[PDB]
Write a protein that binds this ligand. Structure first.
Ligand SMILES: [Zn+2]
Lengths: 94, 74, 105, 74, 102
């Protein structure tokens, strides 16, 4: 009865809820249901930006397959984010 | 706890403009991590704003206070 | 496993997270991208309601503030500093003696 | 009215990280146009915000309200 | 000495901010005519300072986008990527690009 996109959104929302429950436990602070839904809606939108950017970045380098340099480019604005993603890339590569 | 790669793959494909576009296996793994970092960043920043106000929980008000600076970081 | 929620995960989402028509807020939306020069149960997330909170850098967790976020913070500080000027503008006074006409039209 | 290519070029060179970096003349002329759209988009959003508040003119409080989304769109 | 380098950096910054501000004021006077509303001087100052700072963001991205395509010279493809958050912005810029070609 759920459309494809409703099922993706629900899957996203549930994973967001679970990550928030972990944070809530670790930092001793609960989240409202509304906050968790808000973070999910932000995350779904963020993934749209990420996906569109990744496709355009890959194409800008004459590639149809997105690679880990496209992802690094996604992370370019924050030094700690880029470092984190660069480290993880090396990890995967090992 | 985190996003399944099966889901992230479909999430990325949902927005691609071109049917030719693919995602490398390593890139997909990285996008799994990046989405989690985003969620956790929003959640912990909302927590800090709640702690600073001695609030009982993170409500939408607290998330909205941290939002412009979160979205500008990503 | 699968991209979609299992029966158990779906049940959890339905009872813990899913927003309902009888909740005070039944939907959260994000403002849509619009370029101007070229709702009872519905909460649209605001990027402006808390503008007076934005003239200082907020806490981070794992993700440092970006340069554009630092510029945003600095612009908010500039605006705060000018908010109560009537008429004659301090920024003009700080820059206009450096203007070279060859730079402009 | 608008920006001169020469000014746009000085603004960009001031900020490049690498002195090898150069800008094609076509790129430069397109940056002239992009800059103008940016400024005009800022001013028009400010006008629309002032109207939403029945204000008679655009003060900085109105600009403040459209700034985050403007930075995110560029 | 280092103090001289700093005074010169400062004075050259203010020159470019002055030129941005002049131009921003002209563009906002045109919008003001067209939309029949005025801007405070403070609003024009703020838009100028935003535009000045936004050049740094554009400049850094152009350079990274060029480098992602193995180029040290920025081109109009790099510039179009700056417009990518909006389909209509991207359309408007791609046209200007094509007009600029011919
Ligand atoms: Zn930030």
């Amino acid at each position: 009865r759920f459309s494809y996109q409703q099922r993706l959104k629900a899957a996203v929302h549930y994973t967001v809820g679970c990550l928030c429950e972990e944070v809530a436990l670790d930092k001793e602070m609960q989240f409202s249901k509304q906050t968790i839904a808000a973070i999910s809606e932000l995350t779904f939108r963020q993934c749209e930006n990420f996906a569109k950017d990744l496709e355009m970045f890959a194409r800008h380098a004459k590639r149809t397959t997105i690679n880990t340099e496209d992802v690094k480019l996604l992370a370019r604005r924050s030094n700690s984010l880029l470092k984190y993603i660069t480290d993880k890339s090396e990890e995967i590569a090992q | 706890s985190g996003f399944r790669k099966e889901l992230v793959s479909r999430l990325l494909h949902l927005h691609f403009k071109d049917d030719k576009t693919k995602v490398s296996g390593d890139a997909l793994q990285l996008m799994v991590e990046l989405l989690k970092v985003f969620v956790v960043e929003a959640a912990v920043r909302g927590v800090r704003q709640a702690q600073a106000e001695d609030a009982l929980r993170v409500d939408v008000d607290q998330l909205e206070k941290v939002l412009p600076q979160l979205l500008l970081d990503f | 496993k699968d991209w979609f929620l299992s029966e158990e995960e779906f049940k959890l989402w339905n009872r813990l997270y899913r927003l309902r028509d009888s909740d005070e807020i039944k939907e959260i939306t994000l403002p849509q991208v619009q370029f101007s020069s070229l709702t009872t149960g519905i909460h649209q997330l605001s990027l402006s309601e808390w503008r007076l909170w934005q003239d200082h850098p907020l806490p981070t967790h794992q993700v440092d503030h970006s340069d554009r976020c630092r510029h945003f913070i600095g612009l908010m500080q500039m605006i705060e500093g000018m908010r109560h000027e009537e008429g004659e503008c301090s920024y003009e006074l700080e820059v206009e003696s450096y203007l070279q006409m060859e730079d402009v039209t």
